[PDB]
Amino acid sequence: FVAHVESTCLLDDAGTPKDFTYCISFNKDLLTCWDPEENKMAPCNSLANVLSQHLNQKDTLMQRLNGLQNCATHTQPFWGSLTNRTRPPSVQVAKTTPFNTREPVMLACYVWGFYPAEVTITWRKNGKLVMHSSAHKTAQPNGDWTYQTLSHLALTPSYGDTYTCVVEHIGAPEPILRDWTPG
Amino acid sequence: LQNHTFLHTVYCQDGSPSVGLSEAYDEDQLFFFDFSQNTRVPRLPEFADWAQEQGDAILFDKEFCEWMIQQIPKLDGKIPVSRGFPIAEVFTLKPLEFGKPNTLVCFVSNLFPPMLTVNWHDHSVPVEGFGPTFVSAVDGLSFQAFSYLNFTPEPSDIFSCIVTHEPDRYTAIAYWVPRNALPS
């Protein structure tokens, strides 16, 4: 089996503690959690009750579950560095193997290395926006505090045309434009 | 003013690691606790400054967690043990460009219990080096992992991520081939 003793801290941009949690689980079952109003561990069944009572007898824990102030002091040294953290994306446009389309050409605008995960992507053919497509893309986490996505544009090539990928992200002041043209 | 969550997950099990601790800011890992050296290890260099926090509760949580694994044998064979098949996803950190240094990423989700080994193969042959594998708890009492492998992509390449849900519970493979590379 696997067991947990998980604590969570809900803090706002300012590092202000908004909520705090302390729950126990066994076999991926949330059994008991700290009830602030009742100031004691309450079941969330026999095991759950035995565990809330077993922990309710330890005054050390009872006085510790100061939960909101702990969240504050503990995170204080770094919280600001985290909520102010950003890293601009890198974007490139190149052709890719077309799929789910009748068009002979498919562009791929790659956006990687950005943080936070929120980003929006739109296309512009000769300066004019195109197509109902979700501009607020979902992103794949790299696990190192950077993300990546891609937007695809199906089209029929015309040598004079110029397609532009427009990426907008908080990590960058101005929108990022990447042009592409047949050949 | 948005609200963010700081996760502090102490978990333990019948198996290795017998006990672990993971901390995350929103969805990203901040530290993982090394229980041999008994210290917090930063996921990134920039967090190294706060991995020496000592006012940290952990011992109590750690001990209570293990007590459950050792005392609560009473459940063995009575209730079905929770188990999730690991799901491996493989992709590259940056967009493909032959001859240009990159790094392969193998994201493992749905891992449960959190017992795993991840091996890399190049054309059905074990890789020459290796990279780090960071396991972390995610909201919902579940686990995940990220294994990395620095490398330089070449057209004939074929790599595979072999994730074994230890010990021999289940084995998953994920292939990666260079397709739609970028011009140089």
Side-chain angles (χ1 to χ4, degrees):
Chain A
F1 298 109
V2 180
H4 301 61
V5 166
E6 178 169 77
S7 317
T8 78
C9 289
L10 195 57
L11 310 107
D12 82 349
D13 270 343
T16 290
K18 245 62 206 235
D19 188 32
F20 137 86
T21 292
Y22 185 85
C23 302
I24 309 304
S25 316
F26 197 88
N27 215 36
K28 218 207 226 290
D29 196 354
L30 194 63
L31 303 178
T32 178
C33 289
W34 167 254
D35 186 343
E37 343 255 42
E38 294 281 351
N39 281 151
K40 52 140 171 54
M41 301 291 298
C44 290
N45 168 77
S46 15
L47 215 186
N49 273 311
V50 181
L51 303 185
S52 329
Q53 183 225 133
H54 186 105
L55 287 173
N56 275 339
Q57 256 76 114
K58 329 247 149 192
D59 220 38
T60 346
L61 180 66
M62 297 301 117
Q63 172 179 63
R64 163 180 169 213
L65 298 173
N66 284 118
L68 278 180
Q69 195 87 80
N70 281 146
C71 287
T73 72
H74 184 247
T75 65
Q76 211 269 338
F78 57 78
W79 209 250
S81 352
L82 307 183
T83 73
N84 292 182
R85 183 194 216 267
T86 79
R87 291 276 202 287
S90 293
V91 35
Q92 244 338 324
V93 178
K95 274 161 65 168
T96 185
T97 309
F99 63 97
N100 192 207
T101 196
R102 56 263 113 224
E103 304 291 348
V105 164
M106 170 137 277
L107 303 183
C109 183
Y110 302 87
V111 185
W112 69 97
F114 56 90
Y115 185 88
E118 293 84 30
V119 71
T120 76
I121 304 166
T122 45
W123 289 87
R124 252 120 69 141
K125 167 193 192 186
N126 292 305
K128 319 133 167 207
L129 179 100
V130 333
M131 7 139 112
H132 307 356
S133 264
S134 291
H136 42 287
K137 357 285 316 188
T138 99
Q140 159 88 230
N142 295 321
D144 64 354
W145 290 62
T146 71
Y147 291 77
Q148 60 168 111
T149 354
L150 38 25
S151 186
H152 287 138
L153 178 59
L155 59 89
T156 255
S158 224
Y159 282 121
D161 295 334
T162 311
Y163 304 98
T164 302
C165 175
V166 198
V167 174
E168 321 205 50
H169 180 272
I170 82 176
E174 293 304 330
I176 303 176
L177 322 165
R178 240 40 133 206
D179 289 349
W180 183 92
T181 216
Chain B
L1 234 48
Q2 353 142 241
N3 276 359
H4 298 103
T5 65
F6 167 82
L7 189 60
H8 183 275
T9 317
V10 175
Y11 60 91
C12 54
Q13 59 181 336
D14 283 291
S16 243
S18 87
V19 48
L21 164 66
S22 204
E23 306 190 312
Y25 162 79
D26 275 343
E27 352 226 58
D28 288 271
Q29 197 187 5
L30 268 160
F31 312 92
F32 68 84
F33 203 83
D34 165 4
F35 282 95
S36 332
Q37 270 51 55
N38 269 299
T39 189
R40 268 186 175 89
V41 186
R43 170 55 186 85
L44 262 39
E46 67 228 61
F47 306 145
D49 263 350
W50 317 288
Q52 297 79 52
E53 209 324 65
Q54 219 49 253
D56 246 305
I58 288 149
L59 184 63
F60 175 95
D61 280 1
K62 194 248 233 228
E63 264 167 5
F64 181 65
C65 193
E66 321 197 89
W67 176 84
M68 284 192 274
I69 288 308
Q70 270 95 83
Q71 294 318 313
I72 307 326
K74 265 126 245 173
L75 284 204
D76 221 303
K78 291 265 214 9
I79 69 168
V81 183
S82 238
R83 274 175 297 249
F85 62 99
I87 290 147
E89 208 206 357
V90 80
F91 61 88
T92 55
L93 208 73
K94 293 141 206 329
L96 176 54
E97 166 153 303
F98 293 115
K100 178 136 152 146
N102 206 321
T103 128
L104 233 20
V105 189
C106 187
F107 177 55
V108 185
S109 63
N110 199 225
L111 185 62
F112 205 100
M115 285 202 253
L116 103 166
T117 307
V118 9
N119 287 281
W120 287 96
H121 265 198
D122 193 357
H123 288 114
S124 310
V125 174
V127 281
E128 216 83 306
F130 60 84
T133 299
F134 306 96
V135 174
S136 66
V138 282
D139 179 14
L141 303 184
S142 206
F143 307 83
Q144 92 193 343
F146 278 98
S147 212
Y148 306 78
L149 189 80
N150 277 339
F151 86 134
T152 303
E154 295 308 345
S156 54
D157 277 341
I158 238 282
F159 285 90
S160 58
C161 179
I162 306 169
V163 171
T164 162
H165 193 202
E166 300 295 8
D168 193 48
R169 302 161 168 296
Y170 175 67
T171 306
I173 306 177
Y175 301 95
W176 180 86
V177 293
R179 292 276 169 289
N180 319 296
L182 265 19
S184 300

